[PDB]
Amino acid sequence: MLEGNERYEGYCVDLAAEIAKHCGFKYKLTIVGDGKYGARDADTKIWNGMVGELVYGKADIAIAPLTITLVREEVIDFSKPFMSLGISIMIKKPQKSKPGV
């Protein structure tokens, strides 16, 4: 039922308006193709993804959880990291079992 930028909500949607608040620019929110990330083919050496739509002119800026890598830094300009992370461990927290007679 909504249209424009009200259709989408989330961390980046609020990050977009806050970035557009300290730099002031009319921004149109668009979804990249097929949920793509930054990758490079070995045979064709063709880039795809949000990184791909930044080097091919189909977009002006990409705001998303994009892993900062060297192969991506040699082609585009990464900003400073806005969210630190690392590989962690997930275990099903137990000990909810209840002793009985």
Binding site: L66, S79, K80, F82, S88, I89, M90
Partner: peptide
């Protein structure tokens, strides 16, 4: 689920712009 322990490596996300943009 439950996150146990710290992080194994140090990585992060960022906002990307074209070179010379």
């Amino acid at each position: 689920t439950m996150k146990v322990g710290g992080n194994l490596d140090s990585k992060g996300y960022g906002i990307a712009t074209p070179k010379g943009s």
